[PDB]
Amino acid sequence: MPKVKRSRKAPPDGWELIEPTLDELDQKMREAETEPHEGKRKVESLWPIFRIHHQKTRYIFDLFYKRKAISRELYEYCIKEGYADKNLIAKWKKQGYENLCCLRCIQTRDTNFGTNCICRVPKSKLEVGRIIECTHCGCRGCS
Amino acid sequence: RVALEKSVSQKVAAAMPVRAADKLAPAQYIRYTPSQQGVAFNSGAKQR
Amino acid sequence: WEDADFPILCQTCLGENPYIRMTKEKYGKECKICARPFTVFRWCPGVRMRFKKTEVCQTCSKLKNVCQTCLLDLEYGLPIQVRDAGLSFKDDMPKSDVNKEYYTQNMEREISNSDGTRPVGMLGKATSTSDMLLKLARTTPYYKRNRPHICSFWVKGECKRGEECPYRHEKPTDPDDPLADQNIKDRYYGINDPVADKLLKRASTMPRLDPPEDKTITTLYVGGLGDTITETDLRNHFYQFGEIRTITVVQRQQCAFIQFATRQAAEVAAEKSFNKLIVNGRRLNVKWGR
Amino acid sequence: MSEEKLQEKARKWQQLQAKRYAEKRKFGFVDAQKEDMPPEHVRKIIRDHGDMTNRKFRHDKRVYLGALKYMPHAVLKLLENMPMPWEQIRDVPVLYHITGAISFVNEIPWVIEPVYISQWGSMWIMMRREKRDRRHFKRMRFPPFDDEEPPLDYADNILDVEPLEAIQLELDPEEDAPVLDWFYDHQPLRDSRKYVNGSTYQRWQFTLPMMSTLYRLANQLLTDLVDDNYFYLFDLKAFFTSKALNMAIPGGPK
Amino acid sequence: PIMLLSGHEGEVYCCKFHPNGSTLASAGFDRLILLWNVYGDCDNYATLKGHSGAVMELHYNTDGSMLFSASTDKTVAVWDSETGERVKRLKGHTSFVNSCYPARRGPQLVCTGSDDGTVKLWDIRKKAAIQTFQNTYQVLAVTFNDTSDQIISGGIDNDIKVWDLRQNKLTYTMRGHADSVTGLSLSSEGSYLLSNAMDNTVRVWDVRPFAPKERCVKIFQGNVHNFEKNLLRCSWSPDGSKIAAGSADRFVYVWDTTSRRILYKLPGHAGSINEVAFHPDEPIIISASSDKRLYMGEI
Amino acid sequence: QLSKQYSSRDLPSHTKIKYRQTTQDAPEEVRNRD
Amino acid sequence: NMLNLLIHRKNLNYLHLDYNFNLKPVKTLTTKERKKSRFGNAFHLCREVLRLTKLVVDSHVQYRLGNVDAFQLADGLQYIFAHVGQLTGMYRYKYKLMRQIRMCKDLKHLIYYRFNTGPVGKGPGCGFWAAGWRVWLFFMRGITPLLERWLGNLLARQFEGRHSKGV
Amino acid sequence: PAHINDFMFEQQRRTFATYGYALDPSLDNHQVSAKYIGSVEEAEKNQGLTVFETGQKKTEKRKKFKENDASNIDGFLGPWAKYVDEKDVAKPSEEEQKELDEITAKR
Ligand SMILES: O=P(O)(O)O[C@H]1[C@@H](OP(=O)(O)O)[C@@H](OP(=O)(O)O)[C@@H](OP(=O)(O)O)[C@@H](OP(=O)(O)O)[C@H]1OP(=O)(O)O
Ligand SMILES: [Zn+2]
Ligand SMILES: [Zn+2]
Ligand SMILES: [Zn+2]
């Protein structure tokens, strides 16, 4: 019933303290995944998923880099099994990109004029206080 | 020969119909002089 | 299919910034009149204004000489019926299905042989802009056209999208008003468009000089003259317009009284000058004297 | 002229010029990539659209239909990667339409040739010793599902289940030392630059013990001929001639 | 004929002749340097490569034997017109080196103007710097004086500056331009120097042993700037007879030294003209414009 | 108004034009001949 | 979903395609509907190809649910590929298929009569499904451009309309 | 058919968008000067500051929340952090509500 594991390799042994957090997070992902398509909207019914996804990888990003509270081996096992997100992480590690909402909000080809979401514009340079809801992620100004 | 064959190419590329879709050409820039020039509209400028 | 280089649009509808960014889509939609597929151009009018779209073929535009989305005339800028009436035009574009598709086909074949420079047909033979047309014309850009629609949710209370409600969260207009229901097809054909009738009544109530009863009342009173005018200047106002017989420049009342030699000449002069004979900046009031 | 004027002039022009000639908008710079979405994105879209009967969608109707022209590609791409009985689960890269209209498995199954033949040879031995030593073989039923039983959901039905041991043959630790660990992997040495080109998986290079065990393992699916004069009048040219003369050798085609 | 040349992928910023009048060099955003033959069909033989940034200024030597080319990527480059290959990568510039000038008829020596706040003097042989006059700010154009002993530079603060190579101080500062100067070119007189500046005015100056102390000589009207603030460059004719300028107005401006009249505002271009080149032999004009191609006008 | 219909017989075929070679009868020889 | 959207767009409400891709009428149809509702070889070739793939993926789903076995899955797949003639009914619509069909018989006589060379018996448990799989993959390599052409024509004709002007 | 440079057009457009004034684009055959078009007095008083150019602005930025510790199960607002000075419901009120009911009946 968990993210049943493909490796068949033994998890390295920090796995036992990050186990329950990831487990309840996957509980929350399954639940917010099934949450059925109410009179909510058709653009915004996919905002939970991106939200949760960021969370999980964010969490592991902490416990390896900002706490150094897990090993390289355990962290790599946790990427390989699809808890984390290899490139969301490898993007987070850049300099202008600490809080990037979803990896698609910087895809230049997915938008006709060749730009990023207004998600990506610094809040100051707009200064108009206008609510921003990037249609992709639902984020409100990732950076 | 030139005009002939280019029109050929378009008519036969219709008969490709499985269009090996090429990229969209780079964004063009066009400079436009309205007929209705004046400072009532265009924020006083003449061209856009 | 049509194929264009740019839209052909009113300056009101094109926007405010000098720098606009606009997208094209080849064979994107069907002209609501020409009924055939067109290329559709979409631009963001301004900050917090709805994206507008060209809504009529380039031929369906050049034929009646209008703005492909604003639909108002190109030079003056009134509804198509008003401009037609002011040009005294009689536009014979067919209505039924087969006749209209056939007429569109041949009109397009003949407009293919053009220069792309000016409207085809009587729209060149009717460019004599009458003072009624110039008088009804819009002056500055009525840029209230480009604000978004009315939020059914925010009209019922529901626009829970915060401030992002996709429509102006104001009061819905009472549907009884004539200025509410104007179908695109009629507004292009000019048959019973309420804005046309309201603007025509406004043009009928607008001030124009009145004619007298007697043919012998050939003295015309111009009120509000001022002492910066000359008798020779009043002449030059009413000299080549026919013949003037006499001119009394009343300086004790700042007015003038022009006796003419031709009734139609003086009538044309004074009516054409009604409150709008602006010589040296004076609002003279042209009327027939006692 | 005012100095602070010139100073914020240097400020403005510095920032302006700096961004305008930034390496980002250099000439031939091409934007980096499109990296992967999460899986739940696909899963949610497709379970949402369901069977396009709810009028809430009603516009993906047209694209849904128009995508039929390409479904013989999706089928071919799907069936050419099926998971090969020594595996329980295979994960594949998937390219899909953002409305769930179509789903192309986006991959080509490269294999190492001697590895592959050895794996299928082990299958030969296992299948045979199993069919000999099973009391009664039960043949599944076709079709396995009924005409109006709607298809199952992955998420509700297979997502969390445990996947039922596959047909490994159990390799002996001494003689098959050089392969016992990586034998039954999906793409065996995918990420070890000593033996494979890289992650595009061309170009193997192997050790001679590796090759010897592989050989012995695939021994069942193999010819124990050593040379070519076995096919004396039984090669391509003999057949080309016979066909040309309309005469036919004993065991050859006509 | 008009002879429009094409084959450049992005703007061409710099175009100039062989000092022979034999071959053509042009360069710009595409980070490489194209060469052509001026005569015949105006055909392209060679393409020099290597510069990672935009080629902001190419400059010949006075024989035509080695090529200097200032790049955006903090570097100048000298190459062999014999081969097209790099001999030297003048590194060490701490920012955008926009302008380059090889000493003519003196020892081989180079002055480079850059966006670092310094003008730099370099010897080609030593792989080391000679002198550097950090005034305060970006220098946008630089040219020597025919003695190879003063160095003139024009930047953002509108006061054209000249350093003495031996006392190394601000020798000559001249004033009168209302906004940033964008181009200097000293005529083959060795005396008269031409200055474009986007304030819409072009000026003429003269560096001599003795000058009237306020050497603002001739003034012409016509050049334009806009939201582009592209770098605008001027030149004298081989004779000191006609001044050629470009502008963001798509009009090649050809004026005269004598009557300062507008001999030409020629249309024909599509984007801003960044550099006009005079033939050292002929009445041949080559326009490098931001419309990604060139023109070969004959007057 | 261009259709996307298509035909089995409008597939590309014989896409190179043979030209009359040096010995077959090229317009040069027949230009010469008596 | 695609095939049902096709059926219901043509306004043919009296037919329905069930979940194993059988097409069945839910009334008795008059002549006008027996005619209006005839379909072509494009529709049916696509139907039958999808039926083959559903047979395959559903054998795999049975494996993954726990219902069968590794050996039963392997042999059932071998079965599927050997007997496409009696399970799909594809040959009706592109009869050239029998090339493939005869091939997958020849292979099976080889493999079987080398599989059971010893004590191994004539029973079901022989799944060595590489060969037939290969065969149907090459068939698909050939058929995809054909079917993409035929389906492009069908969809065009359904959305533009048939051209009776300059035939 | 112009050909212009790319950073600069977007710079001028964003300027005119968020500041309300812009370096007018008319490339006239009569040599005009650099004139700030639109909100001219705004360009004068704001020193021509562009939305892209950094500049001193003491403008009160709207108050927002910040819950960026991703271990709280319902905690992480992260990049999706709402604005703190935002409303919690959006609706029209008693007078406009009855008026809209009256209008929907009139229609
Ligand atoms: O039904 P088919 O396509 O004709 O294949 C079967 C079958 O093969 P499956 O095992 O895949 O069903 C049999 O196999 P066994 O009975 O051997 O297990 C058998 O082949 P045998 O002849 O070897 O029995 C039989 O053939 P027949 O009806 O002649 O017995 C026949 O294969 P054929 O193509 O040989 O008919
Ligand atoms: Zn976004
Ligand atoms: Zn996002
Ligand atoms: Zn974001």
XYZ file of N, CA, C and O in Angstrom, chain C residues 53-163:
444
model
N -10.462 40.791 -30.253
C -10.196 39.954 -31.416
C -10.892 40.523 -32.643
O -12.025 40.987 -32.563
N -10.211 40.466 -33.780
C -10.816 40.884 -35.033
C -11.940 39.930 -35.399
O -11.715 38.732 -35.532
N -13.146 40.466 -35.617
C -14.364 39.666 -35.675
C -15.086 39.737 -37.020
O -16.273 39.447 -37.094
N -14.399 40.095 -38.102
C -15.037 40.178 -39.407
C -13.947 40.149 -40.459
O -12.847 40.638 -40.239
N -14.255 39.557 -41.604
C -13.252 39.334 -42.635
C -12.629 40.646 -43.077
O -13.194 41.717 -42.867
N -11.444 40.571 -43.672
C -10.856 41.784 -44.226
C -11.651 42.290 -45.416
O -11.723 43.499 -45.639
N -12.264 41.394 -46.189
C -13.129 41.849 -47.272
C -14.441 42.383 -46.726
O -14.923 43.428 -47.168
N -15.042 41.673 -45.777
C -16.246 42.187 -45.151
C -15.988 43.527 -44.490
O -16.936 44.257 -44.200
N -14.723 43.868 -44.249
C -14.378 45.188 -43.733
C -14.238 46.196 -44.859
O -14.922 47.221 -44.877
N -13.345 45.924 -45.809
C -13.130 46.862 -46.900
C -14.412 47.193 -47.638
O -14.565 48.318 -48.112
N -15.362 46.260 -47.706
C -16.606 46.522 -48.422
C -17.374 47.670 -47.781
O -17.693 48.662 -48.438
N -17.670 47.562 -46.491
C -18.429 48.596 -45.807
C -17.555 49.630 -45.109
O -18.096 50.560 -44.511
N -16.230 49.485 -45.153
C -15.291 50.471 -44.602
C -15.500 50.704 -43.100
O -15.918 51.777 -42.671
N -15.201 49.677 -42.301
C -15.341 49.728 -40.852
C -14.129 49.073 -40.190
O -13.242 48.541 -40.855
N -14.109 49.110 -38.855
C -13.033 48.531 -38.057
C -13.369 47.093 -37.703
O -14.427 46.822 -37.140
N -12.437 46.186 -37.974
C -12.758 44.769 -38.019
C -13.295 44.231 -36.707
O -13.882 43.152 -36.708
N -13.121 44.938 -35.597
C -13.686 44.535 -34.314
C -14.580 45.604 -33.717
O -15.631 45.280 -33.158
N -14.166 46.874 -33.790
C -14.969 47.963 -33.246
C -16.243 48.170 -34.043
O -17.245 48.609 -33.475
N -16.214 47.861 -35.337
C -17.355 47.868 -36.247
C -17.831 49.274 -36.584
O -18.665 49.449 -37.472
N -17.288 50.284 -35.927
C -17.668 51.647 -36.237
C -16.882 52.127 -37.448
O -15.862 51.551 -37.820
N -17.389 53.181 -38.080
C -16.783 53.697 -39.296
C -15.319 54.036 -39.061
O -14.863 54.180 -37.928
N -14.572 54.172 -40.148
C -13.143 54.409 -40.008
C -12.786 55.876 -39.853
O -11.960 56.202 -38.997
N -13.410 56.776 -40.608
C -13.050 58.187 -40.501
C -13.796 58.863 -39.356
O -13.182 59.391 -38.426
N -15.121 58.842 -39.395
C -15.906 59.542 -38.380
C -16.052 58.648 -37.155
O -15.589 58.992 -36.066
N -16.651 57.483 -37.327
C -16.729 56.577 -36.207
C -18.109 56.472 -35.600
O -18.253 56.466 -34.376
N -19.126 56.402 -36.434
C -20.481 56.199 -35.965
C -20.999 54.855 -36.428
O -20.402 54.215 -37.297
N -22.100 54.383 -35.854
C -22.689 53.126 -36.323
C -22.881 53.140 -37.835
O -22.998 54.197 -38.453
N -22.886 51.950 -38.435
C -22.872 51.854 -39.892
C -24.109 52.506 -40.493
O -24.037 53.139 -41.554
N -25.261 52.360 -39.838
C -26.483 52.994 -40.322
C -26.361 54.514 -40.329
O -26.764 55.174 -41.290
N -25.850 55.089 -39.242
C -25.702 56.540 -39.164
C -24.817 57.045 -40.296
O -25.154 58.010 -40.986
N -23.645 56.441 -40.466
C -22.756 56.873 -41.537
C -23.419 56.733 -42.892
O -23.299 57.622 -43.741
N -24.113 55.620 -43.120
C -24.818 55.440 -44.386
C -25.815 56.568 -44.621
O -25.855 57.166 -45.703
N -26.629 56.874 -43.611
C -27.621 57.930 -43.752
C -26.968 59.277 -44.009
O -27.401 60.020 -44.895
N -25.903 59.592 -43.271
C -25.233 60.862 -43.452
C -24.554 60.989 -44.791
O -24.417 62.101 -45.304
N -24.137 59.874 -45.371
C -23.648 59.864 -46.736
C -24.768 59.646 -47.738
O -24.504 59.607 -48.943
N -26.005 59.500 -47.261
C -27.168 59.273 -48.119
C -26.982 58.038 -48.994
O -27.480 57.976 -50.118
N -26.244 57.058 -48.484
C -25.938 55.857 -49.243
C -27.093 54.864 -49.186
O -27.934 54.915 -48.284
N -27.138 53.972 -50.180
C -28.085 52.851 -50.225
C -27.265 51.597 -50.509
O -26.986 51.279 -51.666
N -26.887 50.887 -49.447
C -26.053 49.702 -49.577
C -26.902 48.478 -49.900
O -27.751 48.065 -49.106
N -26.659 47.894 -51.073
C -27.421 46.742 -51.544
C -26.568 45.478 -51.441
O -26.051 44.961 -52.431
N -26.412 44.975 -50.200
C -25.771 43.691 -49.951
C -26.828 42.662 -49.615
O -27.659 42.915 -48.735
N -26.831 41.505 -50.266
C -27.980 40.604 -50.169
C -28.111 39.997 -48.784
O -27.198 40.044 -47.966
N -29.280 39.431 -48.524
C -29.603 38.929 -47.196
C -29.773 37.423 -47.128
O -29.223 36.797 -46.224
N -30.525 36.822 -48.046
C -30.778 35.389 -48.005
C -29.484 34.604 -48.197
O -28.458 35.146 -48.591
N -29.546 33.304 -47.912
C -28.328 32.500 -47.842
C -27.611 32.430 -49.186
O -26.459 32.859 -49.314
N -28.270 31.871 -50.199
C -27.579 31.600 -51.452
C -27.181 32.897 -52.130
O -26.042 33.049 -52.584
N -28.104 33.848 -52.208
C -27.789 35.126 -52.826
C -26.644 35.815 -52.104
O -25.794 36.435 -52.741
N -26.587 35.703 -50.777
C -25.528 36.396 -50.049
C -24.179 35.723 -50.238
O -23.161 36.405 -50.369
N -24.143 34.393 -50.269
C -22.872 33.717 -50.512
C -22.362 34.000 -51.916
O -21.161 34.214 -52.125
N -23.267 34.033 -52.888
C -22.902 34.368 -54.258
C -22.391 35.802 -54.369
O -21.337 36.053 -54.974
N -23.110 36.761 -53.781
C -22.651 38.141 -53.797
C -21.293 38.274 -53.138
O -20.438 39.024 -53.612
N -21.076 37.566 -52.032
C -19.791 37.653 -51.355
C -18.685 37.126 -52.242
O -17.611 37.728 -52.329
N -18.939 36.022 -52.940
C -17.927 35.444 -53.815
C -17.519 36.417 -54.913
O -16.325 36.647 -55.145
N -18.491 37.020 -55.595
C -18.106 37.924 -56.677
C -17.526 39.235 -56.172
O -16.596 39.768 -56.785
N -18.038 39.774 -55.069
C -17.443 40.989 -54.529
C -15.998 40.740 -54.133
O -15.137 41.601 -54.323
N -15.707 39.553 -53.596
C -14.331 39.221 -53.248
C -13.465 39.072 -54.487
O -12.314 39.529 -54.504
N -13.994 38.441 -55.537
C -13.217 38.319 -56.766
C -12.876 39.688 -57.334
O -11.772 39.897 -57.844
N -13.808 40.633 -57.248
C -13.550 41.965 -57.785
C -12.653 42.792 -56.871
O -11.902 43.642 -57.355
N -12.721 42.579 -55.558
C -11.826 43.303 -54.662
C -10.426 42.724 -54.702
O -9.491 43.360 -54.208
N -10.259 41.521 -55.259
C -8.918 41.004 -55.510
C -8.144 41.892 -56.473
O -6.916 41.974 -56.389
N -8.840 42.564 -57.387
C -8.231 43.416 -58.400
C -7.998 44.848 -57.918
O -7.912 45.765 -58.740
N -7.895 45.059 -56.612
C -7.753 46.382 -56.024
C -6.302 46.646 -55.648
O -5.400 45.861 -55.953
N -6.087 47.779 -54.979
C -4.773 48.160 -54.480
C -4.660 48.023 -52.968
O -3.595 48.304 -52.407
N -5.726 47.597 -52.293
C -5.712 47.508 -50.848
C -5.667 48.842 -50.146
O -5.280 48.899 -48.977
N -6.064 49.921 -50.820
C -5.821 51.282 -50.358
C -7.061 51.999 -49.852
O -6.971 52.756 -48.883
N -8.216 51.795 -50.481
C -9.435 52.484 -50.082
C -10.615 51.560 -50.310
O -10.520 50.621 -51.108
N -11.734 51.792 -49.623
C -12.904 50.924 -49.799
C -13.331 50.819 -51.246
O -13.061 51.722 -52.040
N -13.997 49.730 -51.604
C -14.444 49.511 -52.973
C -15.861 50.032 -53.109
O -16.712 49.792 -52.247
N -16.115 50.751 -54.200
C -17.460 51.166 -54.543
C -17.884 52.526 -54.032
O -17.073 53.452 -53.949
N -19.165 52.651 -53.685
C -19.722 53.945 -53.323
C -19.065 54.546 -52.094
O -19.227 55.749 -51.856
N -18.343 53.747 -51.307
C -17.620 54.286 -50.161
C -16.474 55.192 -50.588
O -15.841 55.819 -49.735
N -16.179 55.247 -51.884
C -15.316 56.267 -52.437
C -16.155 57.381 -53.028
O -15.786 58.558 -52.965
N -17.300 57.015 -53.598
C -18.230 57.976 -54.170
C -19.122 58.642 -53.127
O -20.041 59.377 -53.507
N -18.880 58.416 -51.829
C -19.694 59.034 -50.786
C -18.856 59.613 -49.650
O -19.371 59.785 -48.540
N -17.586 59.924 -49.895
C -16.696 60.448 -48.864
C -16.885 61.937 -48.588
O -16.066 62.527 -47.879
N -17.935 62.562 -49.119
C -18.210 63.975 -48.858
C -18.804 64.089 -47.455
O -20.015 63.991 -47.241
N -17.917 64.286 -46.479
C -18.311 64.280 -45.073
C -19.241 65.438 -44.740
O -18.800 66.586 -44.645
N -20.522 65.134 -44.541
C -21.504 66.156 -44.207
C -21.326 66.629 -42.769
O -20.909 65.866 -41.894
N -21.647 67.906 -42.535
C -21.475 68.500 -41.214
C -22.248 67.759 -40.134
O -21.873 67.826 -38.961
N -23.323 67.061 -40.499
C -24.005 66.199 -39.539
C -23.083 65.083 -39.060
O -22.992 64.802 -37.857
N -22.386 64.436 -39.995
C -21.456 63.379 -39.625
C -20.341 63.918 -38.737
O -20.100 63.402 -37.639
N -19.666 64.978 -39.185
C -18.620 65.587 -38.371
C -19.154 66.009 -37.008
O -18.438 65.946 -36.004
N -20.417 66.420 -36.951
C -20.989 66.909 -35.705
C -21.291 65.783 -34.732
O -21.208 65.985 -33.516
N -21.660 64.607 -35.235
C -21.933 63.497 -34.332
C -20.672 62.760 -33.894
O -20.738 61.968 -32.948
N -19.532 63.027 -34.527
C -18.335 62.211 -34.352
C -17.848 62.197 -32.907
O -18.023 63.170 -32.170
N -17.260 61.073 -32.496
C -16.596 61.009 -31.201
C -15.281 61.779 -31.245
O -14.609 61.848 -32.278
N -14.913 62.358 -30.102
C -13.811 63.312 -30.006
C -12.544 62.710 -29.413
O -11.461 62.854 -29.987
N -12.655 62.062 -28.261
C -11.562 61.378 -27.594
C -11.915 59.906 -27.436
O -13.085 59.524 -27.548
N -10.936 59.057 -27.154
C -11.195 57.613 -27.189
C -12.068 57.146 -26.044
O -11.663 57.208 -24.881
N -13.274 56.681 -26.363
C -14.193 56.155 -25.357
C -13.682 54.782 -24.945
O -14.203 53.738 -25.343
N -12.641 54.786 -24.121
C -11.960 53.555 -23.764
C -12.684 52.770 -22.683
O -12.094 51.864 -22.095
N -13.947 53.081 -22.406
C -14.739 52.200 -21.561
C -15.171 50.944 -22.293
O -15.754 50.053 -21.668
N -14.916 50.862 -23.600
C -15.349 49.703 -24.370
C -14.591 48.445 -23.962
O -15.138 47.338 -24.014
N -13.331 48.591 -23.557
C -12.447 47.458 -23.333
C -12.410 46.992 -21.878
O -11.483 46.276 -21.490
N -13.331 47.354 -21.114
C -13.279 46.748 -19.795
C -14.057 45.438 -19.797
O -14.915 45.225 -20.656
N -13.800 44.542 -18.857
C -14.395 43.203 -18.958
C -15.895 43.178 -18.707
O -16.501 44.211 -18.420
N -16.487 41.985 -18.788
C -17.934 41.797 -18.774
C -18.489 41.875 -17.358
O -17.807 42.360 -16.459
N -19.729 41.440 -17.152
C -20.391 41.517 -15.854
C -20.414 40.123 -15.245
O -20.883 39.170 -15.873
N -19.900 39.994 -14.023
C -19.721 38.688 -13.401
C -21.031 38.105 -12.897
O -21.515 38.501 -11.833
N -21.613 37.183 -13.667
C -22.811 36.479 -13.219
C -22.684 36.036 -11.772
O -23.612 36.205 -10.972
N -21.534 35.477 -11.414
C -21.267 35.151 -10.022
C -21.360 36.392 -9.142
O -22.166 36.451 -8.210
N -20.547 37.409 -9.434
C -20.551 38.611 -8.606
C -21.831 39.418 -8.735
O -22.015 40.376 -7.973
N -22.698 39.080 -9.684
C -24.031 39.662 -9.711
C -24.968 38.883 -8.801
O -25.885 39.462 -8.213
N -24.755 37.578 -8.669
C -25.479 36.785 -7.691
C -24.763 36.709 -6.349
O -25.341 36.202 -5.385
N -23.525 37.194 -6.268
C -22.729 37.141 -5.055
C -21.561 36.181 -5.116
O -20.678 36.240 -4.252
N -21.519 35.302 -6.114
C -20.687 34.107 -6.057
C -19.238 34.306 -6.493
O -18.449 33.371 -6.340
N -18.842 35.470 -7.008
C -17.516 35.542 -7.620
C -16.437 35.416 -6.562
O -15.687 36.360 -6.302
N -16.328 34.233 -5.984
C -15.393 33.898 -4.934
C -13.996 33.832 -5.416
O -13.134 33.331 -4.695
N -13.701 34.296 -6.626
C -12.334 34.388 -7.105
C -11.616 35.606 -6.546
O -10.627 36.054 -7.132
N -12.104 36.157 -5.441
C -11.419 37.270 -4.809
C -11.585 38.524 -5.623
O -12.705 38.931 -5.946
N -10.466 39.160 -5.947
C -10.490 40.306 -6.838
C -10.335 39.921 -8.298
O -10.464 40.790 -9.166
